[PDB]
């Protein structure tokens, strides 16, 4: 594997692959590309303000990072086609930059000689978007450029998939109360894209924000195609998010009935977990699920024949999503 | 006018009454010196542009004396302590306005929704919660125009003084209220939806909802997801609700794509935000999302003071 | 057949002390915790032990009963007696020794209550006056004797400053010093501006959105830990908007003319194999020390010597996890104090 | 009227615009940045630190409109190609981009036809560094490119100047407990310059950080050249900072004596204020002083003949420093 973008997702992908050890023996990272010195990349891998200090020996050379006696070549090629990692025997590209979020853009990795590309984000409606343990089965040996979806997609998908299987979703709306991310502003100022809300200080604001996670969920769950919409509120934490789903269902239900039906689909599920301890956002930081169902927030509102059903799942939008991406990575082998 | 509880709401009530009626005395659990200091210097709302000092038994603002008591039992009124949230408790205090929900056995007033149910016989009145003053007008005018069959609310809400600075024992013993407010999204109860029946009787039993407490000092928004009687578009929802904001000092309007800190210091109980309106349709099934911002401190406080002035 | 601990105050320090004793396992075998006292339900105490916003989720089986907390099949009786003298844990649970972590018994006279309830010994998780021993493990744990009944583990700042000042003074001689600790907010601070116990104008202010100047006795009282520095240091804190992780800056006039390299090499040698006084030259920031087991971590990258002829100021800096770092120091002092 | 072009409509640039607007025979006529006028108008109107501008703010395709007055917005990354002198009559450029932090770079504004340039940062040793009400008197009619120093320089300079005047500073060290700034990272990641500490999430860290404010204070107070060093701790608030100074003085002093001596130099001083109410960082947000002396934190440590003196001053590193720069801009008109 070649990692393009050794950012939050790229470095956590590296940590996840490393900590899996033998359960990841079928893959091996060999090289990294970013816009930065190997010295700083080694430093950021080692010391993480959100996830703590890597329990491993981390150093840098003029052109690489060294972890536990193993050399990882670092390039600084802004153009994906000019990365010569295919010098390192790269077969697949983990595309984590946010600048190649297209079949047409990620084509560059296939030009540099990659077999396959997995993009760490939504990447259009014209390729497969995989949420592991929802639709990883649509993957075939012909697939060259695949989206691992967004963090919100990996949280919403299993909640919606199993809720719809059990009760039938006619229509739903989503709000994700979502940790701030690296595209946001530390202080009010000019932001790429020019968005009036993305421009605002992330740490001291609730910021309404677009996600396609609901609108595009059709790519992951065809039966929900065109049935969901939603948006995010970016709030003042570094990591840890929850998705609220409000839906009209086919079936009349109670909260207990919704919770027992969804919970059964979490039994032994490493992608879609369960928690009824009344956790809060920081409790999911470092968890390995893409989605954690929280029955304690389930709410069914009924007046005669009209019924609204609220369900909620937590997610570590960094490490939780990353563990989903790595599961999807391993399946590509 | 006696302010019981010179806290966030009590001190902002004092600032609001001053900047506009007159306060004559204050009760809390603290020295006059600290109360004068907290009135003067406010981490959320800035420095009071007035001369503030203390004596051994009072606060002085612009040459005017405001007597300070430290009596825990009110049996020794703007009730802002959070410890007298009942007709029975507030009995201790001509009239009492409680700065919070206070049960189903007295009137709960959201100014510019139901302040007209007030009569000269009313002695103990609830000004409702901050969330009630935000939700009420959004639900009232949305229901008037389109008919709400059923709705759920989520308020993305600033942390408040009942929450914990760091994980620890909290009064009430709630597992979530116990957790560090500044570094958590914390699911949290509000009665604002379930009890909205007290303010808007026809929405009784039609709404539920809850809060997510998030890591800002002040400034909140309410999301309402509803099944309506009428098929609508976002533009149609926004134009219909917006007309009810024209000249409305309690229910304002903003389409500039603001964020939470922009409402800090605003005088509305509720600010409709058309930019977040969302209609989801598959055949005959339709969900409508509407959103209103609120300064849960100063916005709610300006609502309480409007309700206070109507008592004269 | 070991010394049985009652924890009074299952707060930040109390719960982390419990986690530290648990994770030490056999290295803590000559201690065992049997009982807890606080102002709350066992259900909430078990919840707070399990889920920690700063230090993460306890890798253990945690539950509650009507009157206790259960960790890994082991029962820990929970009382809710606000008066230390009325905690029946001596007769009920066999408590030898009280770990006093409430902040409300921060005196020989107040902590006397535990000796009245029948405890042999009390270790206070804070400064507790100038009339009992204040121990910083690996500076002065040697002044402990079997006669000692009520002992202070010092403050977090004391456990950070003490070794930095002790070894700096040993190598160069401190004539005079001032300290500033840039310190995480703590549970005594306010979430939003308002009335605070003690009435302090600064402690009253919203902790998350302010730099708040604040008293520490850590410098003034450092004499209790290091007699030769007695009356030579003063200092104060700036409380800043993080949940945990602090650093102490020491500015001193030394006997010796020095360079930064010379100060760093001399102090560093006293960190070799030192479980209490660690070393880090990776250019870390506050969050990097959250969960570290040192009371103090020397940071040579911040060392600064300012010279104009014969006038010289030396700035040295050490990080500390004011929660878990200090707690690991308190537990080291606990394991010695009980085994005396 | 004094006619101003703002280059860089960032934190400092937008606050400079607010300050000049609220003031006095000074007027902004044009703005240059790398963004839409729509977003610039939005950020001027709504400020997460300083609140909502009490004025009517709108945008056109090429300008910002405030209270029926048009302010042309350019998007020229090269200072020499900003046509604001011929188009808008710009006299003085307020350089607030961070990318022209040199006599040689800011020369570009003089090439585009500007009379003078004031740079909102340290800008080297080969032009004057002015802290208003310390050394604004060294300005002459020949000075065309001037540094306003840093926020920390405007806080430290008066504290050190008046402390040294009264007692003589032999040697000092500074720590500024400083709000996070726009160069810092919202989350751990690659940062320009590659600094291991500047790379770290600003909102959840105390981050040790360089300032030249002490080492280069020689530019403002020549006699303290080589006598001071120091550094910053970047902490998790949006704005509001304090400078601690620890010094060996010529004179034996008490805290009361230090406080009375320094306080005298704050009387009527619009640049170097006084506050003994036991304030905290947020209380200085929106204040107009470059420095606010806080006697409550004064500390003298003595053993025999060895004495350390700790003094402290607060500063709104945004609006306080900005009010200092606008003061230096108005003095430019008297030249
Ligand atoms: N952070 C999350 O919660 C999260 C989770 C799921 C999806 N994602 C997606 O993953 C991607 C990465 O986001 P992130 O949070 O890691 O951001 P980040 O800014 O931390 O990571 C981006 C990294 O890519 C590097 N980079 C940028 N342009 C490059 C180029 N042209 N060539 C090489 N390297 C380049 C940057 O220097 C940086 O290190 C985005 O597409 C994002 O939407 C993020
Ligand atoms: N802050 C908000 O967003 C908001 C908005 C609407 C309503 N409210 C309600 O207003 C009330 C006050 O909340 P707040 O945010 O001002 O909190 P706060 O804690 O700052 O104010 C409460 C004040 O009352 C004092 N007090 C406590 N017990 C007392 C007693 N027995 N006698 C006298 N004084 C006593 C406290 O010392 C404190 O000064 C609560 O009911 C709250 O639910 C809060
Ligand atoms: N937090 C730090 O960084 C730190 C570091 C070292 C020292 N300390 C000291 O440790 C002590 C505790 O501080 P903390 O941060 O753990 O605070 P905390 O508020 O989290 O813990 C105090 C606990 O004691 C309980 N309590 C209070 N009064 C009680 C009583 N009368 N009886 C029983 N339980 C009672 C409270 O309910 C709470 O659970 C203080 O003396 C503090 O100064 C704190
Ligand atoms: N923020 C503070 O506390 C503070 C205080 C004193 C000094 N300063 C200095 O002020 C300057 C600006 O700092 P800031 O915090 O306002 O930063 P900022 O990022 O908020 O502002 C910089 C602005 O300049 C614009 N810009 C960048 N390059 C440009 C170019 N070539 N042409 C035109 N516009 C360009 C950017 O779009 C942005 O709007 C820096 O030199 C900084 O060191 C900052």
- Other CB atoms closer than 10 Å to residue B2's CB: what's the count? 16
- Ligand 1 geometric centre to CA of D207 (Å): 23
**H or E segment to which residue C75 belongs:** strand C74-79
Q: Does the C-beta of B190 come closer than 6 Å to ligand 2?
A: no
Residues listed for chain B: 312
Give the integer Cα–Cα distance in Å for A62 and B71.
70
User: Which residue ranges make up each domain of chain D?
Assistant: 2-120, 151-317
Contact A310 B152 (CB under 8 A): yes
The H helix count followed by the E strand count for chain C is: 7, 18
Q: Is A213 in the pocket of ligand 1 (CB under 6 A)?
A: no
Shortest Cα distance, chain A CAs vs residue C46, angstroms: 11
Q: SS3 string of D264-308?
A: HCCCCCCCEEECCCCCCHHHHCCCCCCEEECHHHCEEEEECCEEE
Task: Say which of D205, D226, D302 has its CB closest to residue C287.
Answer: D205
Task: Say if CB C9 and CB C102 are below 8 A apart.
Answer: yes
The full length of chain D comes to: 335
Q: What gap in Å lies between CA B252 and CA B138, rounded to an integer?
A: 10
Nearest CA to C188 among C211, C214, C153?
Answer: C214
Neighbours of C27 (CB within 10 A): 11
Please enumerate, as own/partner, the contacts of C289-292 that have beta carbons within 8 Å and a separation of 24 or more.
C289/C245, C289/C319, C289/C320, C289/C321, C289/C325, C290/A52, C290/C54, C290/C55, C290/C244, C290/C245, C290/C321, C290/C323, C290/C324, C291/A52, C291/C55, C291/C321, C291/C324, C292/C319, C292/C321, C292/C324, C292/C325
A94-113 burial: b if 16+ Cβ within 10 Å, else e? bbbbeebbbbebbbbbbebe
Torsion angle in degrees (nearest 10) through CA of D45, D46, D48, D53 = 50
The answer to whether A227 touches A250, Cβ cutoff 8 Å, is: no
Closest ligand to the CA of B78: 2
Q: Which helix (H) or strand (E) holds A274?
A: strand A272-274
Residues of B with CB under 8 A from a CB of C: 6-8, 28-31, 33-35, 37-38, 41-44, 159-161, 163-170, 173, 175, 178-184, 215, 217
C-alpha D160/C-alpha D147 separation (Å) is 19
Buried-state track C188-207, b at ≥16 Cβ within 10 A, e below 16: bbbbbbbbbeeebbbbbbbb
Say how far apart CA D93 and CA D313 lie, in whole Å: 30
Alpha helices, DSSP H, located in chain A: 8-20, 38-46, 103-111, 151-167, 255-264, 319-331
Chain D residues touching A191 at Cβ < 8 A: 39
User: Dihedral of CA B99/B102/B104/B105: which sign?
Assistant: negative
Q: How far apart are the first and last CA of chain B?
A: 11
Instruction: Give Cβ neighbours of residue B72 (< 8 Å, ≥ 6 apart).
Output: B29
**Residues 6 or more apart from C107 whose CB is under 8 A from it?**
C128, C129
Say yes or no for a CB contact (<8 Å) between B286 and A246: no
User: Is B54:B36 a contact under the CB 8 Å cutoff?
Assistant: yes
The secondary element (H helix, E strand) that includes residue C331 is: helix C324-338
The partner residues of C240 in beta bridges, in order of sequence, read C184
Residues A45, A67 contacting (CB under 8 angstroms): yes
CA A239 to ligand 1: nearest atom: 3
Contact A229 B278 (CB under 8 A): yes
Enumerate helices (H) and strands (E) in chain A, giving the number of each: 6, 18
Q: How far is B36 from chain D (nearest CA, A)?
A: 11
Strand partners, C235: C179
CB nearest to D199's CB, from A40, A185, A187:
A40
Q: Alpha carbon of C318 to those of A194, B87, D96: distances in Å? A: 43, 56, 36
Phi, then psi, of A73 in degrees rounded to 5 = -60, 135
Task: Return the CATH number of the domain spanning residue range D2-120.
Answer: 3.40.50.720
**Does residue D12 line the site of ligand 4, with CB under 6 A?**
yes
Half-sphere exposure of C34 (CA within 13 A, CB side): 19
* Distance in angstroms (rounded) separating the CA atoms of residues C164 and B214: 39
Whether residue A234 contacts residue B261, with contact meaning beta carbons closer than 8 Å, is answered with: no
Whether the CA torsion D6, D9, D11, D15 is positive or negative: it is positive
How many Å apart are CA C114 and CA A327, to the nearest integer? Answer: 55
Q: Are B225 and A246 in contact (CB under 8 A)?
A: yes
> For chain B, which chains pass the contact test of at least 3 CB pairs under 8 Å?
A, C, D
Phi-psi map region of B69: left, alpha, beta (phi>0 left; psi -120 to 50 alpha): beta
Bin A142: left if φ > 0, else alpha if -120 < ψ < 50, else beta: alpha
Looking at chain D, the number of H-run helices and the number of E-run strands are: 7, 18
Of the options 3.10.310.30, 3.40.50.720, 2.50.20.10, 1.10.260.40, the CATH number for the domain spanning C3-125: 3.40.50.720
User: Which ligand has the nearest atom to the CA of A94?
Assistant: 1
- B262 closest CB neighbour out of D52, D278, D283: D52
Residues with Cβ < 8 Å from B193, sequence gap 6 or more? B135, B151, B152, B153, B207, B208, B209
Mutate to test the interface with B, among A301, A303, A305, A312 (most CBs of B within 10 A): A301
For chain C, percent helix, then strand, then coil, each to nearest 5?
Answer: 30, 30, 40
The response to whether residue D32 sits with its C-beta less than 6 Å from ligand 4 reads yes
Strands D26-32 and D69-74, how do they pair?
Answer: parallel
Q: How far is CA D210 from CA B74, C67, D197, in A?
A: 55, 54, 10
Sign of the CA dihedral with A195 first, then A201, A205, and A211 last: positive
Q: Which CATH number fits domain C156-322: 3.40.50.10800, 3.40.50.2300, 3.30.360.10, 3.40.250.10?
A: 3.30.360.10
A333 class by beta-carbon count within 10 Å (0-12 exposed, 13-18 middle, 19+ buried): exposed
Closest C-alpha to C234, from D307, D160, D227, D173:
D307
The closest of D250, D226, D241 to D289, measured between CA atoms, is D241
A-chain CB neighbours of D187 within 8 Å are: 8, 49-50, 180-182, 238
Using CA atoms, how far apart are residues A262 and A252, in angstroms rounded to an integer?
15
Best mutation site among C6, C9, C216 for ligand 3, i.e. most ligand atoms within 8 A of its Cβ? Answer: C9
Question: How far is the C-alpha of A86 from the C-alpha of A63, rounded, in Å?
Answer: 16
**Terminal-residue alpha carbon distance, chain C:** 15
In 3D, which of B81, B76, B90, B68 has the Cα closest to residue B13? B81
Reduce the DSSP state of residue B251 to 3 states and report it.
strand
Q: Is B312 exposed, middle or buried (0-12, 13-18, 19+ CB in 10 A)?
A: exposed
**What are the backbone angles phi and psi of residue A9, rounded to the nearest 5°?**
-70, -45
Half-sphere exposure of D259 (CA within 13 A, CB side): 13
* Residues β-bridged to residue B52: B61
Ligand with smallest separation from the Cα of C83? 3
Ligand-binding site membership of A211 (annotated): yes
**DSSP for C198-229?**
T--TTTTSBGGG--EEEE--TTTTGGGT-GGG
| CA B175-B180-B186 angle, 5° bins | 55
Was B9 annotated as part of a binding site?
Answer: yes
Report the nearest-CA residue for atom 43 of ligand 4.
D121
For residues A165 and A168, what is the distance between their CA atoms, to the nearest angstrom?
6
Contact in structure between A166 and A254 (CB atoms under 8 Å): no
3-state secondary structure of A188: coil
Whole-number Å distance between alpha carbons of A292 and A312: 8
Q: Which residues does A70 contact at the CB level (< 8 Å), separation at least 6?
A: none
Nearest C-alpha neighbor of B47 from the set C129, C193, D243, C149: C193
The CA distance from B141 to B150, in Å, is: 15
Q: Is the CA virtual torsion D262, D263, D264, D265 positive or negative? A: positive
Distance CA C72, CA C70 (A): 7
Out of A7, A37, A182, whose CB is closest to D186? A182
Give the angle D187-D189-D190 at the CA atoms, nearest 5°: 145
Report CA dihedral (A271, A276, A278, A282) to the nearest 10 degrees. Answer: -20
Pick the CATH number of B130-296 from 2.60.40.420, 3.40.50.300, 3.30.360.10, 3.40.50.150: 3.30.360.10
* Partner-chain residue, chosen from A37, A184, A194, that has the shortest CB–CB distance to D36: A194
CA distances from C78 to B52, C86, C93, C120 (A): 47, 13, 10, 20
Smallest CA–CA separation between D247 and chain B, in Å? 31
β-pair partners for A314: A242, A292
Reported residue count of chain C is 340
Catalytic residue among B80, B130, B134, B302: B130
CA distances from C119 to A66, B167, C91, C149, C150 (A): 54, 29, 10, 9, 10
Please give the DSSP secondary-structure letter assigned to residue C173.
-
- CA-nearest of A134, A80, A98, A123 to A331 is A134
CA distance linking residue A213 with residue B228, whole number of Å: 25
The CA-atom distances, in angstroms, between C191 and each of A69, A86, B28, B147 are: 46, 54, 18, 41
In whole angstroms, what is the distance from residue A298 CA to residue A310 CA? 5
Q: How far is CA B214 from CA A272, C106, C269, D149, in A?
A: 25, 34, 46, 38
D171 with C307: Cβ contact below 8 A: yes
Q: Which residues make Cβ contacts (< 8 Å) with residue A302, sequence separation at least 6?
A: A252, B150
Contact D122, D216 (CB under 8 A): yes
Q: Is D25 exposed, middle or buried (0-12, 13-18, 19+ CB in 10 A)?
A: exposed
* Ligand located closest to D11 CA: 4
Ligand 2 centre and the CA of B27: distance in Å? Answer: 12
Among residues C141, C147, C105, C146, the alpha carbon closest in space to that of C124 is found at C105
User: Would you state the CATH architecture of domain A151-317?
Assistant: 2-Layer Sandwich (3.30)
Beta-strand (E) ranges in C125-184?
150-152, 174-184
Cα–Cα dist A179/A318, whole Å: 10
Q: To 10 degrees, the CA torsion angle through B249, B250, B253, B257?
A: 120
CB-ligand 4 contact for D121 (6 Å cutoff): yes
Q: Give the integer Cα–Cα distance in Å for D284 and D281.
A: 6
Residue B155 phi, psi (nearest 5): -100, 120
Is the CB of B130 within 6 Å of ligand 2? yes
Residue D142's contacts (CB-CB under 8 Å, 6 or more residues apart) are none
Report the binding-site residues of C for D-glyceraldehyde 3-phosphate. Answer: 155-157, 186, 216-217, 239
Fold of B2-129+301-310: Rossmann fold (3.40.50)
Across the interface, whether the CB atoms of B179 and C53 are under 8 A apart is answered yes
Find out whether D100 and D107 touch, Cβ atoms under 8 Å.
Answer: no
Residues A258 and A302: their CA atoms lie apart, in Å, by 14
Q: Is A78 marked as binding a ligand? A: yes
Give B93's contacts (C-beta < 8 A, 6+ positions apart): B2, B4, B74, B77, B79, B84
List of chains touching D (3+ CB pairs within 8 A): A, B, C
- Angstrom distance (rounded) from CA A213 to CA A178: 13
Q: Is A76 helix (H, G, I), strand (E, B) or coil?
A: coil
- Rounded to 5 degrees, φ, ψ at A268 are 70, 15
Q: Which residues in D75-100 are b (16+ Cβ under 10 Å) and which e?
A: eeeebeebebbeebebbbbbbbbeeb
According to DSSP, the residues that pair with C319 across neighbouring strands are C247, C297
Q: What is the resolution of this structure in A?
A: 2.2
Residue B106 CB coordination number (10 Å): 18
**Spatial distance between the Cα atoms of D169 and D214, rounded to a whole number of angstroms:** 13
Query: What 3-state DSSP class applies to D154?
Result: helix
Contacts of A213 (CB under 8 A, 6+ apart): A122, A149, A150, A152, A153, A155, A156, A174, A176, A230, A243
In this complex, do B41 and C193 lie within 8 Å of one another by their Cβ atoms?
yes
Three-state DSSP class for D149? coil
Q: Pairing state of beta strands C121-124 and D228-235?
A: unpaired
What lies within 8 Å, CB to CB, of C272 at 6+ separation is none
Asked about A96 being catalytic, the answer comes back as: no
d(CA C278, CA C298): 6
Query: Could you tell me if C69 and C37 are in contact, meaning their C-beta atoms sit under 8 angstroms apart?
Result: no
Question: Ligand 1: which of A2, A5, A122, A185 to mutate, judged by most atoms within 8 Å of the beta carbon?
Answer: A5
Residue C311 DSSP class: E
Which residue does chain C place closest to D210, by CA atoms?
C302
């Amino acid at each position: 594997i070649g990692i393009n973008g050794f950012g939050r997702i790229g470095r956590l992908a590296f940590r996840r692959i490393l900590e899996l050890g033998e359960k990841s023996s079928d893959i091996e990272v060999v090289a990294i590309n970013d816009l930065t010195s190997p010295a700083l990349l080694a430093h950021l891998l080692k010391y993480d303000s959100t996830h703590g200090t890597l329990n491993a020996d981390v150093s840098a050379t003029d052109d690489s990072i060294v972890v536990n006696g193993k050399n990882y070549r670092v390039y600084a090629e802004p153009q994906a086609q000019n990365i010569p990692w295919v010098n390192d025997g790269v077969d697949f590209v983990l595309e984590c930059t946010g600048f190649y979020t297209s079949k047409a853009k990620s084509q560059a990795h296939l030009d540099a000689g990659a077999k396959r590309v997995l993009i760490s984000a939504p990447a259009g409606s014209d390729l497969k978007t995989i949420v592991y343990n929802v639709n990883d089965d649509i993957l075939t040996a012909d697939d060259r450029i695949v989206s691992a979806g967004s963090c919100t997609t990996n949280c919403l998908a299993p909640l919606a998939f199993f809720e719809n299987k059990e009760f039938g979703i006619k229509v739903g709306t989503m709000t994700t109360i979502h940790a701030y991310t690296s595209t946001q502003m530390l202080l009010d100022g000019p932001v790429r894209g020019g968005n009036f809300r993305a421009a605002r200080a992330a740490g001291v604001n609730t910021i309404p924000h677009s996600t396609g996670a609901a609108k595009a969920l059709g790519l992951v769950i065809p039966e929900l195609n065109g049935k969901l919409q939603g948006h995010a509120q970016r709030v003042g934490v570094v990591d840890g998010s929850l998705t609220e789903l409000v839906a009209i269902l086919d079936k009349k239900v109670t909260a207990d009935e919704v919770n027992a039906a969804i919970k059964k689909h979490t039994e032994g599920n490493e992608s879609f977990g369960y928690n009824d301890d009344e956790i809060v956002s920081s409790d999911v930081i470092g968890t390995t699920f893409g989605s954690i169902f929280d029955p304690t927030q389930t709410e069914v509102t009924s007046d005669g024949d009209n019924q609204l059903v609220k369900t909620v799942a937590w997610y570590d939008n960094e490490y939780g999503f990353t563990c989903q991406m790595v599961r999807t990575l391993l399946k590509f082998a």
